[PDB]
Design a protein around this ligand. Structure first.
Ligand code: AU
Ligand code: AU
Ligand code: AU
Ligand code: AU
Ligand code: AU
Ligand code: AU
Ligand code: AU
Ligand code: AU
Ligand code: AU
Ligand code: AU
Ligand code: AU
Ligand code: AU
Ligand code: AU
Ligand code: AU
Ligand code: AU
Ligand code: AU
Ligand code: AU
Ligand code: AU
Ligand code: AU
Ligand code: AU
Ligand code: AU
Ligand code: AU
Ligand code: AU
Ligand code: AU
Ligand code: AU
Ligand code: AU
Ligand code: AU
Ligand code: AU
Ligand code: AU
Ligand code: AU
Ligand code: AU
Ligand code: AU
Ligand code: AU
Ligand code: AU
Ligand code: AU
Ligand code: AU
Ligand code: AU
Ligand code: AU
Ligand code: AU
Ligand code: AU
Ligand code: AU
Ligand code: AU
Ligand code: CL
Ligand code: CL
Ligand code: CL
Ligand code: CL
Ligand code: CL
Ligand code: CL
Ligand code: CL
Ligand code: CL
Ligand code: CL
Ligand code: CL
Ligand code: CL
Ligand code: CL
Lengths: 171, 171, 171, 171, 171, 171
């Protein structure tokens, strides 16, 4: 009955709504991460800012998906947004570990949506994922792995601290 | 055990977390409102934009509250965000009615938080509500009542349409 | 006993004070008109603005008269300002009808003051009315008649609405 | 029956209309003060200008109140504006005394409206008074007391004139 | 006998003079803190500068209070300023602890002045505290708690130093 | 035990701390002078401003001395700051008399510190006094004597007022 809908499976429509939920959950998680690091007894405002920026990116992804849902003539359906998995997020290392786990769950969701879009022969969907999501996730996951390595190095030892300072201050 | 906390009741702390939830729910509602009006079979993009702007304002209010929670040494606690009350929002009139009901529920929540802050002799809280929330809500509710009146006039009759056009095009 | 007073009758002096009162009453009326249209259940802000501008013009006329009274060595005397004739002003059509009636009462007052100034052989008074009031009133009354005609056309019928839209949007 | 009205008592609504009247009366008083000082036999144009500026401020206060009345869903009701208490205002000292008495009556009215708003648990009203009226009145009353002191000094004696000139011309 | 004084209790007048003393004491304390960190055998000029800026803020607060005292028609009365509690201030951690204790004593004084102003039904006083003092203190106390946490982290351990460097140099 | 200290007597060190106290007392006195002239019943804002500027200069002198104390490796020690000698300061003439007495006490203190520095063969101290204090005091004392003469002339008589006006308005 939708007058623009063409080659748009009910399966993809549903999976897109689920991915919106996944992205909004991710944004909520990053909001909680950021405010934790803003606590006076944590007080790492740069970490708060890093996570605040990610909450925004994740919300923007959801909005992009919702725009696409309408462009294809699907019906956006919203579900409860579950609260984040933790109320306190431990150290910078713990938080960046939780963040890469999250990004990896979104990345797997995008890959699963491509597999569905391929099975449904929906190239507009594939193009959309490619254009806005797949490379963005890979780039973000690389940066977070980079961060994990640096944090481990900085917290580990004077040899690690040493090499980090040399790179940052001499190079 | 918080080293900055002063004159900040556990009651207000809790009510602030609940109000964050209320504001994030409101933002989610407005996201659903906006995307509904973006549907090709609805296609009122200006309405989508009006509600998109409100989703942003409501999120910003929640973020402001969360910032304040930390500034007072309270602990931000997040809860499930319930999905909006409807999946489809009817006419522009229905949506603007749902929106004023929502804003009125937030306004009542702010008034209830002032009553608690007064009972707890917490003037920083009162000041904060005054500075960022009370007048903003009143102004928004006035605009929405204005909108309700105009929509009713425009949809009602040629006499109503007539007066609207005169004001918009002659005055 | 006034050392600048020349050729300035007590009759004109009195009539000038009465006209000040008439102009301030008019300004008060337009204040009430404008705020009525600002009511959320009326919500024609352009009409509010049109009347707000007229309240200003009418006050300025009174101030001009008061300045002139002093320039001639008359004594400005103020009287009670009666409240406007109505508390609610009905439709845009009703309000613009009330406004033209008002302007016509001021115009008749100016004409009556010219007749007195002529009988008193006071050409400075005539010049003053000509320079600041007579043409202003005529222009305003023409605009209001124009408005009455347009409002009647717009509220009347699809043929009227039709012609208005053609003029506004095509021409 | 007003669709925006929330937490807005009939008592405050009425007191706001009365305060509008009080502010418009004040503006009318200052108009009479200013024109008196413009009389050729008085000829203190700076005093005329000081009072003209106050007539404007007082009108603006009334307009602010009327805007607020509508924003809260109250009904602006206008009453007769009584003419000022005097037709001639004596010396600069007499006029500035009459002016501080007036400002003190408005200030007391604002304080009485806060007491009512507090009894009615209306924090938007309190905020509004704070934001636009309480500090403005205090500042104005301080300036007028300053003026009274200076006028008394200047009119009093050569020792007073002396100190005024030293401050104005040397410092 | 003061010609501007209205609704200004002798109790608030006295408490304002005491708070001026409290603020000037605070400014003197911060002067001593800053010069200590300027000692060649301490040599933390950034800490000296942080405290120099606070000495200025505290003096400005006192001056603001004194201005307000005169605006209300109270009489500014000055008392001995006691010298700071210490002649030497230990480590950066010790000094920032002494500073938050101080700010908390000023904050409690402001809250006690609000309680008095409320008991005296003095809304201009409440507004003044809100506008210039309550939020400023909260913001300053949050920053100092942030500083305490960071200093403890940096002085504590290589894991703490590690996380601080990551936030500052990577994020 | 100070590693920079050279040719810096304990006698000068102590006298510098005492002079800091003297300068801060002077600044406090000028704060009280300035606020007195800001009283509505005094209302000489130019006098308030003149004294406010001097309070700043005196504080700056103390800060300069404290900086120098550290540059020489002395230990800044702060004492109680006694409140000013009066709570009310009479006429402009009385205040300017009190001010020149004060400046003369500071000037004598500087001269006494030079005598000590000379006896201690401390040329850096002499240079410092010369560079920042001796000429500044002389210039300030000359200006204040000038002011005393003018105030006496202006308050004295029409012949005095006469000559002042001629100089200010014709020359
Ligand atoms: Au954050
Ligand atoms: Au942040
Ligand atoms: Au694909
Ligand atoms: Au595909
Ligand atoms: Au770097
Ligand atoms: Au570096
Ligand atoms: Au570096
Ligand atoms: Au939208
Ligand atoms: Au939109
Ligand atoms: Au409150
Ligand atoms: Au409160
Ligand atoms: Au329009
Ligand atoms: Au139009
Ligand atoms: Au038009
Ligand atoms: Au209006
Ligand atoms: Au308007
Ligand atoms: Au005529
Ligand atoms: Au004539
Ligand atoms: Au047009
Ligand atoms: Au048009
Ligand atoms: Au058009
Ligand atoms: Au005037
Ligand atoms: Au004037
Ligand atoms: Au209030
Ligand atoms: Au209130
Ligand atoms: Au001056
Ligand atoms: Au002068
Ligand atoms: Au001069
Ligand atoms: Au310093
Ligand atoms: Au410094
Ligand atoms: Au208060
Ligand atoms: Au209060
Ligand atoms: Au940094
Ligand atoms: Au760094
Ligand atoms: Au770096
Ligand atoms: Au001053
Ligand atoms: Au001043
Ligand atoms: Au010397
Ligand atoms: Au020497
Ligand atoms: Au001069
Ligand atoms: Au002159
Ligand atoms: Au002159
Ligand atoms: Cl955040
Ligand atoms: Cl495909
Ligand atoms: Cl939207
Ligand atoms: Cl409170
Ligand atoms: Cl208006
Ligand atoms: Cl004629
Ligand atoms: Cl005027
Ligand atoms: Cl209240
Ligand atoms: Cl310092
Ligand atoms: Cl109060
Ligand atoms: Cl001062
Ligand atoms: Cl020497």
């Amino acid at each position: 009955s939708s007058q623009i809908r063409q080659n748009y499976s009910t399966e993809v429509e549903a999976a897109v709504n689920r991915l919106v939920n996944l992205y909004l959950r991710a944004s909520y998680t990053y909001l909680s991460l950021g405010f934790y690091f803003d606590r006076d007894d944590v007080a790492l405002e740069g970490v708060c800012h890093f996570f605040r920026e990610l909450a925004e990116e994740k919300r923007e992804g959801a909005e992009r998906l919702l725009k696409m849902q309408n462009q294809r003539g699907g019906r956006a359906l919203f579900q409860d947004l579950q609260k984040p998995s933790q109320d306190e997020w431990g150290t910078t290392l713990d938080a960046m570990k939780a963040a890469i786990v999250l990004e990896k769950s979104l990345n797997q969701a995008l890959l699963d949506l491509h597999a569905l879009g391929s099975a449904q022969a929906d190239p507009h969907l594939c193009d959309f994922l490619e254009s806005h999501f797949l490379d963005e996730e890979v780039k973000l996951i690389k940066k977070m792995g980079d961060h994990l390595t640096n944090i481990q190095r900085l917290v580990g030892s004077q040899a690690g601290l040493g090499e980090y300072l040399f790179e940052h201050c001499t190079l």
